[PDB]
Amino acid sequence: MAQAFESCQLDSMVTAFLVVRQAALLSYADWFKASFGSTRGYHGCSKKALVFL
Amino acid sequence: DYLLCCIQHCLAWYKNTVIPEAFYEDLDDILESITNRMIKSELEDFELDKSADFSQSTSIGIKNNISAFLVMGVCEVLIEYNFSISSFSKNRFEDILSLFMCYKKLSDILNEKAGKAKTKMANKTSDSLLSMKFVSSLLTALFRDSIQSHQESLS
């Protein structure tokens, strides 16, 4: 996820997302609020990473 | 800034002298891409004025201040480049105006930040990179020149 938002790569994002979704089956929501804390505030230094997200 | 000044002087020398094969066109079209993207850049691409206030207290303010002076020099060198391509294209003069508006925005931002503290840095009254040859050319063209083929685009 760090690599993905530094490069603004969607492929690695999709991999990570589907992996946590399979790991869940509310671990998705746990990982999402973990993102929300000091990852999703600034995914990239530029706020276009949110727009890509 | 200083690299670009060398490149476009080199490239002007390459136009005027060397040609009177498949290499310089690489650098031309690189420069033309830099022109069009540097145009549609504005200030949150370079995280300027908002996130770092270019401060002579912190390291990150110093980073952004150094970055802003690099930008200002880049603007000026690409002004020289866009002027040097053609015989007085309208579109290239629009690019030059856009670059100068960027440069002048950065200058009036830095002036406020040299208006809070004193003018103890001689770094915003640092050199332009434009050749004196160039500016002589530019000022003859701006004021005295009234040739109708160039007038519409210089106006």
Side-chain angles (χ1 to χ4, degrees), chain B residues 71-85:
Chain B
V71 168
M72 275 146 78
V74 168
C75 300
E76 288 198 43
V77 173
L78 301 163
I79 286 157
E80 190 173 357
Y81 178 57
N82 308 328
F83 198 107
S84 69
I85 297 157

Side-chain angles (χ1 to χ4, degrees), chain B residues 44-57:
Chain B
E44 61 251 34
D45 313 327
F46 318 109
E47 59 277 344
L48 303 176
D49 180 79
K50 330 303 185 193
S51 207
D53 276 319
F54 301 5
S55 42
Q56 194 47 59
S57 49

Side-chain angles (χ1 to χ4, degrees), chain B residues 82-101:
Chain B
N82 308 328
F83 198 107
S84 69
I85 297 157
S86 67
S87 192
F88 304 84
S89 309
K90 190 180 311 309
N91 298 327
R92 292 183 178 80
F93 284 137
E94 309 328 309
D95 307 326
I96 284 184
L97 291 166
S98 304
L99 291 166
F100 163 68
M101 274 178 67

Side-chain angles (χ1 to χ4, degrees), chain B:
Chain B
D1 47 344
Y2 290 88
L3 170 52
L4 290 176
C5 203
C6 176
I7 289 155
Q8 68 64 36
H9 277 116
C10 302
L11 193 140
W13 191 75
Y14 200 98
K15 285 172 173 146
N16 289 335
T17 313
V18 178
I19 303 298
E21 296 177 16
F23 169 83
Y24 71 93
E25 303 94 333
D26 302 333
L27 190 52
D28 279 314
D29 301 333
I30 280 153
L31 209 37
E32 289 158 47
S33 169
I34 298 152
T35 64
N36 280 249
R37 293 146 76 192
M38 285 302 330
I39 280 156
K40 59 188 78 175
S41 317
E42 201 279 321
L43 204 73
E44 61 251 34
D45 313 327
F46 318 109
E47 59 277 344
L48 303 176
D49 180 79
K50 330 303 185 193
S51 207
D53 276 319
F54 301 5
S55 42
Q56 194 47 59
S57 49
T58 84
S59 46
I60 301 98
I62 290 164
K63 192 197 292 181
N64 289 272
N65 212 325
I66 288 164
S67 291
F69 293 163
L70 276 145
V71 168
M72 275 146 78
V74 168
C75 300
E76 288 198 43
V77 173
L78 301 163
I79 286 157
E80 190 173 357
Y81 178 57
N82 308 328
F83 198 107
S84 69
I85 297 157
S86 67
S87 192
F88 304 84
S89 309
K90 190 180 311 309
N91 298 327
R92 292 183 178 80
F93 284 137
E94 309 328 309
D95 307 326
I96 284 184
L97 291 166
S98 304
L99 291 166
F100 163 68
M101 274 178 67
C102 139
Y103 180 97
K104 200 263 165 194
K105 170 192 305 306
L106 285 175
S107 75
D108 250 305
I109 294 154
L110 270 292
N111 180 33
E112 176 57 52
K113 296 189 159 49
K116 66 177 77 203
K118 299 303 295 281
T119 176
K120 59 158 187 193
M121 81 177 180
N123 272 357
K124 188 161 53 54
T125 69
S126 81
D127 70 83
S128 165
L129 290 64
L130 302 158
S131 85
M132 199 178 87
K133 174 52 163 55
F134 172 73
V135 176
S136 69
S137 344
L138 178 51
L139 298 214
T140 315
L142 272 154
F143 302 126
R144 283 235 57 180
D145 192 58
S146 298
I147 305 306
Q148 201 73 251
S149 59
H150 319 313
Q151 275 285 84
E152 78 286 31
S153 71
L154 292 164
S155 46

Side-chain angles (χ1 to χ4, degrees), chain A residues 13-39:
Chain A
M13 287 189 233
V14 188
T15 36
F17 262 93
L18 291 158
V19 164
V20 274
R21 285 177 186 218
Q22 200 73 31
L25 302 164
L26 284 238
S27 188
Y28 176 65
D30 222 38
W31 175 85
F32 193 97
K33 311 304 276 289
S35 76
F36 210 49
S38 187
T39 323

